[PDB]
Design a protein around this nucleic acid. Structure first.
Lengths: 52, 137, 190, 172, 197, 138
RNA sequence: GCAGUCAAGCGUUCAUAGCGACAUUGCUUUUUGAUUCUUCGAUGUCGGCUCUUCCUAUCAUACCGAAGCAGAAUUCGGUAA
RNA sequence: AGAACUGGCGAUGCGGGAUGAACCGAACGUAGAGUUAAGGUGCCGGAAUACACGCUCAUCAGACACCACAAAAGGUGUUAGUUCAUCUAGACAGCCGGACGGUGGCCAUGGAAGUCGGAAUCCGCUAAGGAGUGUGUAACAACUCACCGGCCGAAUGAACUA
């Protein structure tokens, strides 16, 4: 029903990010270090896990 | 109009050959000229005219002027006082109302008691004149 | 290292009239006019011609250099926006529930309204800014576009909308419903 | 650790029947008096040769001054110092008129920035820079740029009195 | 040098203003301060809110009646810091805080007289640029001050009246400049001039 | 290896500057590699063409100032996208093969060099009637 | 007792979703300990009852984030007394 | 808890560390002046909102030994430095020009021409070119790179250190 282009688009805006291993934050999927204070602008991130 | 109107404030710039007042120290109230810049807070000045040596100094006790002249970097004292007087710059500072008030408060300090009474009565008569004058006007 | 002084160049072309005074910057062009207030910075403007302006920092630190650069980008955006216009297109998306988008006014407030958002009985409302315009496209479905000179207004209201269209409690990666911007260009230049 | 100066300290081992007139040895020192000059001379010569002051003698001390002291000038500076956790070499540069005030700012900067102190600090070497564009430090080459000039914005006006009846300025 | 001085907190900083003022009151110089709402402080609003909230929550656990009164007004805030600077427990502190008054806005008599400034407290010059700051009126209303608007209303009214007065006086002075230069170009004027006046 | 490569290019430039009695500095702006290869295939007769980084070209000639001293004023004209068309074949003919044939307007002749002389190619493109107006009017 | 670092390894794969070996750095005094300073010309010496308040190293409720989160339910986690 | 040297409290006031037996200072006849100690000079408080070179902005800032703490380990906040490499034979950034021929390279099929994919990674002429890093066409057409050159021109990056 929903097409691959809109799919990949909303994926970009939601699915393609990265996470802080400490504060669990919504980070750019290519960024380097954390943007948040408490995590100390650490560099310990992951890619967000994709479905199934 | 189509004319873009920028307004930049206009500041007294540090630069080569820049005429300057010394405000503190032994050479307080004197003039020198900056030749070359050491850093943001340090420069080289010389006042052979005014009798201030060639020296490095601080921009905090130094105060700038709206005046300036032109000069080749690295110049020594000969060329310094040379182009200085060639520019005839003390004359221009003399023309500076700034300096006029300088010498004003100077004289006013050097006044005498009887001079002050003189001033008193002079201003009295002047006042009467201006009173009735503006009273008419 | 306390950088001594720097600056950057801003293009004020034909058709443009910029008046700057005390960090208050008005600009005029075809589409209208735009004002901005940078009294939060101590940095100087300079004209060389109606084609060319600079803005300069004196005796500056790294942050302030960065501030200068971003301020260039600001005013240039202002220029481009009151000249070419700015245009932000979002596609609605849903797998089951069509995103019922409409517009309504209250005292002439002009709130966008949305319904049917994943079966929501909720009625979502987003105020519209002044100076901005909204359009429902025809050549393509659910291709809502907004436009205006004020890039601020445009981008921020677009995001306002796609933020109020935000699914709770669930996994977004499947529950992708909500609005998403597709493209941004200029009104002018097609 | 006060207003600085410069002295050449020269000393030798104490002569002997074996070695009358032993080798002399020189060092340029920066210090606020000949006293400290001799002191640090013994220090460095202790960390170089197996001598103590009661083993040697000062041939001489000579206070030094600059050739051309009304000349603003650049120097490269090679320094050793001692951090909390170790010790490090370093090369810095200065723009000033004299070696003296150069070292003055050198030390005060190593205090402000690195908080290494005179005792922690060792000079390896100083040299005025002949050529421009051989400077490596940009905070200097800035000042090297040709036909340079600038303002000094936000003037501040020292008040000697408490109140001024008028909103002051910085028009400068 | 006067029986009175009159200060605005405009562009000023609180601690330093209070410092000089306390020293001067102790030395016996009578003061009023007004336009207190236009005080300014270092740091951002949130930090300052936090500090006010520290002072706020710190009260007498078993009776907030007798514990530390937390005042909401810009006026009384500056007052409190002044009291911290002054020995308010003495007869001396009592008399000094009697000598002193502070307001916000600027009432009739104290508007018709003059205002002064104290460079040793001034935001514009004493702060270094690039650095943030704060205003007491916002802090006060944040932490419970009510009357921030009546202030601005009356102050607009009064500034209008005053700017009107100022321009009146300016035109008068320009007339006077004319009818004084007329005799400035006179012998007695030359006499006084070489006398230095 | 990169320095050996730049020196190899220099070797080509020197070999050519010495072996060939003329070279046409040719503005090669916007020229496609296919147009270049067609220039080569037509210039298989005599002319050989050499390109590269103009900085390396100027460095080559500045190094070759020791002998062949008169290449020095090629350097004010080693600018923009330009290359050398070295040759021994006649001026107007090589100029026509370069400018007219296999052109797209678009390779131009920025400068020509022959025996320590400087030609803007205009006197070279002068066809006739100039000697006529010179000999008749004198 | 609480919280962290590193990362062997589990997690079908997958060092680090959740966990985490061997090591290791701290914190709290709601544990016991240790001491014996105070008090033996006097501190009323379990427990529960009733009662108010404070803490947060948050169980729930508000809000958000992450997941080996399809939904549901669940867990990791932050703001939060 | 216990021993070694010395000095101190207890027997001992005063100045200061707010406060304190043990710190530092210095030890007392009763008074005057003066100079100072350690300590300090925004106000409380007597004393420079003194000067000067700089570091730093903390949504939990910091602020005087003794003395009422805080560590490992991390941070592209910030500062400075080292070492290594790229680069003036022209770097990188960044733009710009070419981004081809043998050649639509082979299989796969309605159509796949460097870019759905399966299988090979050659040669030419080149400053250079991938039998292509991707955009776009039903497929060509059209672009930007890999690779090379025009441009600015001196800088760019990596790892480290405190």
């Amino acid at each position: 029903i929903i097409e691959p282009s809109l799919k990949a688009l909303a994926s970009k805006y939601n699915c393609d990010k990265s996470v802080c291993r400490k504060c669990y934050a919504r980070l750019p999927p290519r960024a380097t270090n954390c943007r948040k204070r408490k995590c100390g602008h650490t560099n310990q991130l992951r890619p967000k896990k994709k479905l199934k | 109009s189509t004319d873009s109107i920028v307004k930049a404030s206009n500041w007294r710039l540090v630069e080569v050959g820049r005429v300057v007042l010394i405000k503190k120290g032994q050479s307080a109230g004197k003039l020198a000229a900056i030749v070359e810049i050491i850093d943001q807070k340090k420069v080289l000045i010389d006042g052979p005219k005014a009798g201030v040596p060639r020296q490095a100094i601080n921009l905090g006790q130094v105060v700038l002027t709206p005046l300036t002249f032109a000069l080749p970097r690295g110049a020594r004292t000969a060329t310094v006082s040379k182009k200085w007087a060639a520019a005839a710059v003390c004359e221009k500072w003399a023309a500076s109302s700034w300096a006029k008030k300088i010498a004003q408060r100077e004289r006013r300090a050097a006044l005498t008691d009887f001079e002050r009474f003189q001033v008193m009565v002079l201003r009295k008569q002047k006042r009467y004149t201006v009173k009735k004058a503006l009273a008419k006007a | 290292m306390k950088y001594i002084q720097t600056e950057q160049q801003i293009e004020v072309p034909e058709g443009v009239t910029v008046s700057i005074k005390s960090r208050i910057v008005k600009v005029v062009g075809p589409r209208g006019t735009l004002t901005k207030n940078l009294k939060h910075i101590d940095v100087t403007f300079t004209k060389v011609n109606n084609q060319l302006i600079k803005v300069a920092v004196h005796n500056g630190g790294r942050k302030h250099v960065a501030a200068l650069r971003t301020v260039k980008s600001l005013v240039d955006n202002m220029i481009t926006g009151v000249t070419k216009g700015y245009k932000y297109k979002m596609r609605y998306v849903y797998a089951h529930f069509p995103i019922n988008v409409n517009i309504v006014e209250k005292d002439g407030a002009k709130f966008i309204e949305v319904r049917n958002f994943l079966g929501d009985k909720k009625i979502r409302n987003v105020p519209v800014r002044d100076g901005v315009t909204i359009e429902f496209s025809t050549n393509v479905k659910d291709e809502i576009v907004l436009s205006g000179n004020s890039v601020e207004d445009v981008s921020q209201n677009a995001a306002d909308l796609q933020q109020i269209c935000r699914v709770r409690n669930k996994d977004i990666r499947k529950f992708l419903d909500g609005i998403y911007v597709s493209h941004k260009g200029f009104i002018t230049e097609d | 650790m006060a207003h600085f100066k410069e002295y050449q300290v020269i000393g030798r081992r104490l002569p002997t029947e074996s070695v009358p007139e032993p080798k002399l040895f020189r060092m340029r020192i920066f210090a606020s008096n000949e006293v400290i000059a001799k002191s640090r001379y013994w220090y460095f010569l202790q960390k170089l040769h197996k001598v103590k002051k009661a083993s040697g003698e000062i041939v001489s001390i000579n206070q030094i001054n600059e050739a051309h002291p009304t000349k603003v000038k650049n120097f490269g500076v090679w320094v050793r110092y001692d951090s909390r956790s170790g010790t490090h070499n370093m090369y810095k540069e200065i723009r000033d008129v004299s070696r003296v005030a150069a070292v003055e700012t050198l030390y005060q900067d190593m205090a402000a920035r690195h908080r290494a102190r005179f005792r922690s600090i060792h000079i390896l070497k100083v040299a005025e820079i002949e050529k421009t564009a051989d400077v490596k430090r940009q905070y200097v080459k800035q000042f090297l740029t040709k036909d340079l000039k600038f303002p000094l914005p936000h003037r501040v006006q020292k008040s000697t009195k408490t109140f001024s009846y008028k909103r002051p300025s910085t028009f400068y | 040098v006067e029986p009175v001085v009159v200060i605005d907190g405009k562009g000023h900083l609180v601690g330093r203003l209070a410092s000089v003022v306390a020293k001067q009151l102790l030395n016996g110089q009578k003061i009023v301060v007004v336009r207190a709402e236009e005080l300014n402080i270092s740091g951002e609003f949130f930090r300052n809110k936090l500090k006010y909230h520290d002072f706020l929550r710190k009260a007498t656990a078993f009776n907030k009646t007798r514990g530390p009164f937390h005042f909401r007004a810009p006026s009384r805030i500056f007052y409190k810091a002044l009291r911290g600077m002054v020995s308010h427990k003495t007869a001396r502190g009592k008399a000094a805080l009697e000598r002193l008054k502070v307001f916000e806005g600027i009432p009739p008599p104290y508007d018709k007289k003059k205002r002064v400034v104290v460079p040793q407290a001034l935001r514009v010059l004493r702060l270094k640029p690039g650095r943030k700051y704060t205003t007491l009126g916002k802090l006060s209303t944040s932490v419970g001050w009510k009357y921030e608007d009546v202030v601005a209303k009356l102050e607009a009214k009064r500034k209008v009246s005053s700017a009107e007065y100022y321009a009146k006086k300016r035109a008068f002075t320009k007339k006077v400049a004319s009818a004084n230069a007329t005799a400035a170009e006179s012998d007695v004027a030359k006499q006084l001039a070489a006398l230095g006046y | 290896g990169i320095r050996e490569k730049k020196a190899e290019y220099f070797a080509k430039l020197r070999e050519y500057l010495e072996e060939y009695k003329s070279l046409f500095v040719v503005g090669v702006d916007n020229v496609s590699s296919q147009q270049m290869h067609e220039v080569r295939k037509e210039l298989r007769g005599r002319a050989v063409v050499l390109m590269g980084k103009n900085t390396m070209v100027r460095r080559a000639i500045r190094g070759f100032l020791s002998d062949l001293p008169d290449f020095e004023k090629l350097l004010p004209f080693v600018k923009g996208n330009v290359g050398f068309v070295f040759t021994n074949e006649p001026l107007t003919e090589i100029k026509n093969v370069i400018v007219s044939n296999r052109v797209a307007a678009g390779l131009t002749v920025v400068q020509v060099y022959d025996n320590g002389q400087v030609f803007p190619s205009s006197i070279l493109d002068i066809t006739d009637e100039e000697l006529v107006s010179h000999f008749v009017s004198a």
